[PDB]
């Protein structure tokens, strides 16, 4: 998913 990917980004 696109979101689970943005989340992975925030955690760095």
């Amino acid at each position: 998913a696109h979101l689970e990917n943005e989340v992975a980004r925030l955690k760095k």
Epitope: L3, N5, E6
Partner: antibody
């Protein structure tokens, strides 16, 4: 640090449209998505749309027919076009990151 | 059609105190799939993202800001407010193919 710079003529005049360009830095459009949002005076924020890394697009169900969001992955740009503008479209337009973490300086649009 | 996102209109606190801003969804309990996010609007329409995806701090964001889910709602908590933290707080939920913003909560730090 990532930065988002808004530009483009914007325009004005009713019946015509708005055109905004958002240049990003600090990350590639191939990996993550960019959102578009606007806020009209006294009123709250409203999501307009997002364009993901893989090119897929999601729009605000009630404005869908009047807007188009495209991007050039190589130039790190994202374009927003909204047509058939009306007084109610007057507002401040912002381009933002995937979870609204980073913001662009915004662009003011006065229609009519 | 789509859901309504509800936030308290106003909240007030004081330096060093703790406060909790909430976010309700008209479709039922808020969940991790709603990827709750929070942005702060300061005078001059200065926007900054605080929390993204329920409990992740947008890099550069002071650690006093935390987020989580409590009793069917999303929550942003400021542990030990400061005077600069006075602003309007917006919550945003995701519904499979779109975001919906709450009406915002004006926070006063006396």
């Amino acid at each position: 640090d990532v930065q988002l710079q808004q530009s483009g003529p914007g325009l004005v005049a009713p019946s015509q449209s708005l055109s905004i360009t958002c240049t990003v830095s600090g990350f590639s459009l191939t990996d993550y998505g960019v959102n578009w949002v606007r806020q009209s005076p006294g009123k709250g924020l409203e999501w307009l749309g997002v364009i993901w890394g893989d090119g897929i697009t999601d729009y605000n169900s009630a404005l869908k027919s009047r807007l188009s969001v495209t991007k050039d992955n190589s130039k790190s740009q994202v374009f927003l076009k909204m047509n058939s503008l009306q007084s109610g479209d007057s507002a401040r337009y912002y381009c933002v990151t995937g979870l609204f973490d980073y913001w662009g300086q915004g662009t003011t649009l006065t229609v009519s | 059609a789509d859901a309504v996102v509800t936030q308290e209109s106003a909240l007030t606190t004081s330096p060093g105190e703790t406060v909790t801003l909430t976010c309700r969804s008209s479709t039922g309990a808020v969940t991790t799939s709603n990827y709750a996010s929070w942005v702060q609007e300061k005078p001059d329409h200065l926007f900054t993202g605080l929390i993204g995806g329920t409990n992740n701090r947008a890099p550069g964001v002071p650690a006093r800001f935390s987020g989580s889910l409590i009793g069917d709602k999303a929550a942003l908590t400021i542990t030990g407010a400061q005077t600069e933290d006075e602003a309007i707080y917006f919550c945003a939920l995701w519904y499979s193919n779109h975001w919906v913003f709450g009406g915002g909560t004006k926070l006063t730090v006396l």
